[PDB]
PDB file of all heavy atoms in Angstrom:
ATOM      1  N   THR A 376       0.809  -1.213   0.000  1.00 14.19           N
ATOM      2  CA  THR A 376       0.000   0.000   0.000  1.00 14.19           C
ATOM      3  C   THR A 376       0.846   1.268   0.000  1.00 14.19           C
ATOM      4  O   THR A 376       0.390   2.308  -0.486  1.00 14.19           O
ATOM      5  CB  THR A 376      -0.941   0.008   1.208  1.00 14.19           C
ATOM      6  OG1 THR A 376      -1.555   1.297   1.331  1.00 14.19           O
ATOM      7  CG2 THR A 376      -0.178  -0.311   2.485  1.00 14.19           C
ATOM      8  N   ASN A 377       2.065   1.207   0.532  1.00 14.05           N
ATOM      9  CA  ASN A 377       2.911   2.385   0.632  1.00 14.05           C
ATOM     10  C   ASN A 377       4.372   1.964   0.607  1.00 14.05           C
ATOM     11  O   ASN A 377       4.728   0.878   1.076  1.00 14.05           O
ATOM     12  CB  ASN A 377       2.616   3.179   1.912  1.00 14.05           C
ATOM     13  CG  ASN A 377       1.547   4.234   1.712  1.00 14.05           C
ATOM     14  OD1 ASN A 377       1.361   4.745   0.607  1.00 14.05           O
ATOM     15  ND2 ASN A 377       0.835   4.566   2.783  1.00 14.05           N
ATOM     16  N   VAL A 378       5.214   2.833   0.052  1.00 13.51           N
ATOM     17  CA  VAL A 378       6.659   2.640   0.041  1.00 13.51           C
ATOM     18  C   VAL A 378       7.313   3.890   0.611  1.00 13.51           C
ATOM     19  O   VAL A 378       6.852   5.009   0.365  1.00 13.51           O
ATOM     20  CB  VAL A 378       7.196   2.343  -1.376  1.00 13.51           C
ATOM     21  CG1 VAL A 378       8.623   1.823  -1.306  1.00 13.51           C
ATOM     22  CG2 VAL A 378       6.308   1.338  -2.077  1.00 13.51           C
ATOM     23  N   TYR A 379       8.381   3.701   1.381  1.00 13.99           N
ATOM     24  CA  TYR A 379       9.116   4.810   1.975  1.00 13.99           C
ATOM     25  C   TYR A 379      10.576   4.716   1.567  1.00 13.99           C
ATOM     26  O   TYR A 379      11.191   3.653   1.697  1.00 13.99           O
ATOM     27  CB  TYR A 379       8.984   4.802   3.501  1.00 13.99           C
ATOM     28  CG  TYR A 379       7.601   5.162   3.993  1.00 13.99           C
ATOM     29  CD1 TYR A 379       6.770   4.199   4.550  1.00 13.99           C
ATOM     30  CD2 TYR A 379       7.126   6.463   3.897  1.00 13.99           C
ATOM     31  CE1 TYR A 379       5.505   4.523   4.999  1.00 13.99           C
ATOM     32  CE2 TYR A 379       5.862   6.796   4.344  1.00 13.99           C
ATOM     33  CZ  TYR A 379       5.056   5.821   4.894  1.00 13.99           C
ATOM     34  OH  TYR A 379       3.796   6.148   5.341  1.00 13.99           O
ATOM     35  N   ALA A 380      11.129   5.823   1.082  1.00 14.52           N
ATOM     36  CA  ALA A 380      12.515   5.886   0.639  1.00 14.52           C
ATOM     37  C   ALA A 380      13.295   6.824   1.548  1.00 14.52           C
ATOM     38  O   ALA A 380      12.895   7.977   1.748  1.00 14.52           O
ATOM     39  CB  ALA A 380      12.607   6.355  -0.814  1.00 14.52           C
ATOM     40  N   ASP A 381      14.402   6.328   2.098  1.00 14.44           N
ATOM     41  CA  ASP A 381      15.266   7.106   2.980  1.00 14.44           C
ATOM     42  C   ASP A 381      16.688   7.027   2.442  1.00 14.44           C
ATOM     43  O   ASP A 381      17.324   5.973   2.523  1.00 14.44           O
ATOM     44  CB  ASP A 381      15.199   6.587   4.418  1.00 14.44           C
ATOM     45  CG  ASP A 381      13.790   6.205   4.837  1.00 14.44           C
ATOM     46  OD1 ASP A 381      12.847   6.967   4.536  1.00 14.44           O
ATOM     47  OD2 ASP A 381      13.626   5.139   5.467  1.00 14.44           O
ATOM     48  N   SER A 382      17.188   8.130   1.895  1.00 14.46           N
ATOM     49  CA  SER A 382      18.513   8.176   1.291  1.00 14.46           C
ATOM     50  C   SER A 382      19.427   9.061   2.128  1.00 14.46           C
ATOM     51  O   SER A 382      19.030  10.157   2.537  1.00 14.46           O
ATOM     52  CB  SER A 382      18.442   8.695  -0.147  1.00 14.46           C
ATOM     53  OG  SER A 382      17.666   9.877  -0.227  1.00 14.46           O
ATOM     54  N   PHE A 383      20.643   8.585   2.376  1.00 12.44           N
ATOM     55  CA  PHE A 383      21.599   9.324   3.193  1.00 12.44           C
ATOM     56  C   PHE A 383      23.012   8.879   2.831  1.00 12.44           C
ATOM     57  O   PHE A 383      23.213   8.003   1.987  1.00 12.44           O
ATOM     58  CB  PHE A 383      21.313   9.140   4.687  1.00 12.44           C
ATOM     59  CG  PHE A 383      20.911   7.742   5.065  1.00 12.44           C
ATOM     60  CD1 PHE A 383      21.869   6.789   5.363  1.00 12.44           C
ATOM     61  CD2 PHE A 383      19.573   7.386   5.132  1.00 12.44           C
ATOM     62  CE1 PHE A 383      21.502   5.504   5.714  1.00 12.44           C
ATOM     63  CE2 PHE A 383      19.200   6.103   5.482  1.00 12.44           C
ATOM     64  CZ  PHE A 383      20.166   5.161   5.773  1.00 12.44           C
ATOM     65  N   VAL A 384      23.994   9.510   3.470  1.00 12.67           N
ATOM     66  CA  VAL A 384      25.407   9.209   3.269  1.00 12.67           C
ATOM     67  C   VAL A 384      26.024   8.889   4.622  1.00 12.67           C
ATOM     68  O   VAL A 384      25.850   9.647   5.584  1.00 12.67           O
ATOM     69  CB  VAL A 384      26.149  10.376   2.590  1.00 12.67           C
ATOM     70  CG1 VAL A 384      27.642  10.308   2.878  1.00 12.67           C
ATOM     71  CG2 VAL A 384      25.898  10.363   1.094  1.00 12.67           C
ATOM     72  N   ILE A 385      26.743   7.770   4.697  1.00 12.46           N
ATOM     73  CA  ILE A 385      27.397   7.328   5.917  1.00 12.46           C
ATOM     74  C   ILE A 385      28.831   6.924   5.589  1.00 12.46           C
ATOM     75  O   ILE A 385      29.283   7.026   4.449  1.00 12.46           O
ATOM     76  CB  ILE A 385      26.643   6.168   6.600  1.00 12.46           C
ATOM     77  CG1 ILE A 385      26.351   5.055   5.593  1.00 12.46           C
ATOM     78  CG2 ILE A 385      25.356   6.671   7.240  1.00 12.46           C
ATOM     79  CD1 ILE A 385      26.003   3.732   6.235  1.00 12.46           C
ATOM     80  N   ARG A 386      29.547   6.466   6.611  1.00 12.48           N
ATOM     81  CA  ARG A 386      30.926   6.039   6.447  1.00 12.48           C
ATOM     82  C   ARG A 386      30.988   4.624   5.880  1.00 12.48           C
ATOM     83  O   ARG A 386      30.002   3.881   5.876  1.00 12.48           O
ATOM     84  CB  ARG A 386      31.668   6.105   7.783  1.00 12.48           C
ATOM     85  CG  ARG A 386      33.077   6.664   7.693  1.00 12.48           C
ATOM     86  CD  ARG A 386      33.618   6.991   9.075  1.00 12.48           C
ATOM     87  NE  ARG A 386      33.329   5.934  10.038  1.00 12.48           N
ATOM     88  CZ  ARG A 386      33.654   5.981  11.322  1.00 12.48           C
ATOM     89  NH1 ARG A 386      34.286   7.023  11.838  1.00 12.48           N
ATOM     90  NH2 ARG A 386      33.337   4.958  12.110  1.00 12.48           N
ATOM     91  N   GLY A 387      32.174   4.257   5.390  1.00 11.40           N
ATOM     92  CA  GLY A 387      32.354   2.923   4.838  1.00 11.40           C
ATOM     93  C   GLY A 387      32.208   1.832   5.881  1.00 11.40           C
ATOM     94  O   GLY A 387      31.579   0.801   5.630  1.00 11.40           O
ATOM     95  N   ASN A 388      32.790   2.040   7.065  1.00 12.28           N
ATOM     96  CA  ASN A 388      32.647   1.067   8.140  1.00 12.28           C
ATOM     97  C   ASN A 388      31.255   1.094   8.758  1.00 12.28           C
ATOM     98  O   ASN A 388      30.864   0.122   9.413  1.00 12.28           O
ATOM     99  CB  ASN A 388      33.703   1.312   9.219  1.00 12.28           C
ATOM    100  CG  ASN A 388      33.895   2.784   9.524  1.00 12.28           C
ATOM    101  OD1 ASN A 388      32.950   3.570   9.469  1.00 12.28           O
ATOM    102  ND2 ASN A 388      35.126   3.165   9.846  1.00 12.28           N
ATOM    103  N   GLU A 389      30.505   2.176   8.564  1.00 14.76           N
ATOM    104  CA  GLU A 389      29.149   2.280   9.087  1.00 14.76           C
ATOM    105  C   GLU A 389      28.117   1.619   8.185  1.00 14.76           C
ATOM    106  O   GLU A 389      26.934   1.591   8.542  1.00 14.76           O
ATOM    107  CB  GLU A 389      28.780   3.750   9.304  1.00 14.76           C
ATOM    108  CG  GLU A 389      29.506   4.401  10.470  1.00 14.76           C
ATOM    109  CD  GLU A 389      29.381   5.911  10.467  1.00 14.76           C
ATOM    110  OE1 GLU A 389      28.922   6.468   9.448  1.00 14.76           O
ATOM    111  OE2 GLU A 389      29.741   6.541  11.484  1.00 14.76           O
ATOM    112  N   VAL A 390      28.532   1.092   7.030  1.00 17.12           N
ATOM    113  CA  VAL A 390      27.602   0.386   6.153  1.00 17.12           C
ATOM    114  C   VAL A 390      27.077  -0.869   6.839  1.00 17.12           C
ATOM    115  O   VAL A 390      25.917  -1.256   6.658  1.00 17.12           O
ATOM    116  CB  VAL A 390      28.279   0.062   4.808  1.00 17.12           C
ATOM    117  CG1 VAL A 390      27.326  -0.690   3.894  1.00 17.12           C
ATOM    118  CG2 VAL A 390      28.761   1.339   4.139  1.00 17.12           C
ATOM    119  N   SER A 391      27.921  -1.523   7.636  1.00 15.75           N
ATOM    120  CA  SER A 391      27.496  -2.700   8.382  1.00 15.75           C
ATOM    121  C   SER A 391      26.602  -2.358   9.570  1.00 15.75           C
ATOM    122  O   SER A 391      26.052  -3.275  10.189  1.00 15.75           O
ATOM    123  CB  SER A 391      28.718  -3.483   8.866  1.00 15.75           C
ATOM    124  OG  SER A 391      29.454  -2.739   9.822  1.00 15.75           O
ATOM    125  N   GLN A 392      26.443  -1.076   9.901  1.00 15.73           N
ATOM    126  CA  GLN A 392      25.700  -0.659  11.081  1.00 15.73           C
ATOM    127  C   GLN A 392      24.212  -0.448  10.812  1.00 15.73           C
ATOM    128  O   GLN A 392      23.520   0.130  11.658  1.00 15.73           O
ATOM    129  CB  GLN A 392      26.304   0.621  11.664  1.00 15.73           C
ATOM    130  CG  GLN A 392      26.972   0.428  13.015  1.00 15.73           C
ATOM    131  CD  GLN A 392      27.267   1.742  13.711  1.00 15.73           C
ATOM    132  OE1 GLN A 392      26.566   2.734  13.511  1.00 15.73           O
ATOM    133  NE2 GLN A 392      28.307   1.755  14.536  1.00 15.73           N
ATOM    134  N   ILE A 393      23.704  -0.898   9.672  1.00 18.83           N
ATOM    135  CA  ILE A 393      22.274  -0.829   9.373  1.00 18.83           C
ATOM    136  C   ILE A 393      21.774  -2.268   9.291  1.00 18.83           C
ATOM    137  O   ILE A 393      21.909  -2.951   8.271  1.00 18.83           O
ATOM    138  CB  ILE A 393      21.969  -0.036   8.097  1.00 18.83           C
ATOM    139  CG1 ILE A 393      20.508  -0.229   7.682  1.00 18.83           C
ATOM    140  CG2 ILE A 393      22.930  -0.396   6.970  1.00 18.83           C
ATOM    141  CD1 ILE A 393      19.952   0.913   6.873  1.00 18.83           C
ATOM    142  N   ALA A 394      21.198  -2.743  10.393  1.00 18.09           N
ATOM    143  CA  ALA A 394      20.658  -4.090  10.515  1.00 18.09           C
ATOM    144  C   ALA A 394      19.832  -4.179  11.793  1.00 18.09           C
ATOM    145  O   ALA A 394      20.194  -3.564  12.805  1.00 18.09           O
ATOM    146  CB  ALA A 394      21.776  -5.134  10.525  1.00 18.09           C
ATOM    147  N   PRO A 395      18.721  -4.912  11.787  1.00 17.84           N
ATOM    148  CA  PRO A 395      17.933  -5.061  13.016  1.00 17.84           C
ATOM    149  C   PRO A 395      18.752  -5.724  14.115  1.00 17.84           C
ATOM    150  O   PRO A 395      19.572  -6.607  13.857  1.00 17.84           O
ATOM    151  CB  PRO A 395      16.753  -5.939  12.582  1.00 17.84           C
ATOM    152  CG  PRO A 395      17.212  -6.614  11.328  1.00 17.84           C
ATOM    153  CD  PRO A 395      18.127  -5.642  10.655  1.00 17.84           C
ATOM    154  N   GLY A 396      18.519  -5.288  15.347  1.00 17.86           N
ATOM    155  CA  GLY A 396      19.273  -5.804  16.474  1.00 17.86           C
ATOM    156  C   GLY A 396      20.727  -5.392  16.493  1.00 17.86           C
ATOM    157  O   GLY A 396      21.598  -6.215  16.805  1.00 17.86           O
ATOM    158  N   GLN A 397      21.020  -4.135  16.167  1.00 17.79           N
ATOM    159  CA  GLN A 397      22.380  -3.621  16.164  1.00 17.79           C
ATOM    160  C   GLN A 397      22.428  -2.296  16.913  1.00 17.79           C
ATOM    161  O   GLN A 397      21.432  -1.575  17.009  1.00 17.79           O
ATOM    162  CB  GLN A 397      22.913  -3.437  14.735  1.00 17.79           C
ATOM    163  CG  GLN A 397      23.422  -4.716  14.092  1.00 17.79           C
ATOM    164  CD  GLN A 397      24.618  -5.296  14.821  1.00 17.79           C
ATOM    165  OE1 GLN A 397      25.489  -4.563  15.291  1.00 17.79           O
ATOM    166  NE2 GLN A 397      24.668  -6.619  14.917  1.00 17.79           N
ATOM    167  N   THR A 398      23.607  -1.987  17.445  1.00 18.26           N
ATOM    168  CA  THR A 398      23.833  -0.770  18.208  1.00 18.26           C
ATOM    169  C   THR A 398      25.079  -0.068  17.690  1.00 18.26           C
ATOM    170  O   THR A 398      26.040  -0.710  17.258  1.00 18.26           O
ATOM    171  CB  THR A 398      23.990  -1.066  19.708  1.00 18.26           C
ATOM    172  OG1 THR A 398      23.147  -2.166  20.071  1.00 18.26           O
ATOM    173  CG2 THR A 398      23.610   0.152  20.535  1.00 18.26           C
ATOM    174  N   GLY A 399      25.051   1.258  17.734  1.00 17.98           N
ATOM    175  CA  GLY A 399      26.185   2.042  17.282  1.00 17.98           C
ATOM    176  C   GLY A 399      25.918   3.516  17.486  1.00 17.98           C
ATOM    177  O   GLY A 399      24.832   3.925  17.907  1.00 17.98           O
TER     178      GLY A 399
END
C-alpha cells in the first residue's frame, strides 16, 4: 500500500551498522 525511501550518506565502516538488532 505504501513505500518509503530514505537516502543518506554514511561512512564505509558504518555500512554494516544498518541491521535489526544492532547498536552504534
Side-chain angles (χ1 to χ4, degrees):
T376 170
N377 270 333
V378 194
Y379 290 108
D381 320 316
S382 48
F383 40 87
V384 157
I385 51 163
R386 222 167 44 182
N388 42 34
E389 289 167 348
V390 179
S391 66
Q392 248 193 29
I393 169 154
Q397 279 296 322
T398 326

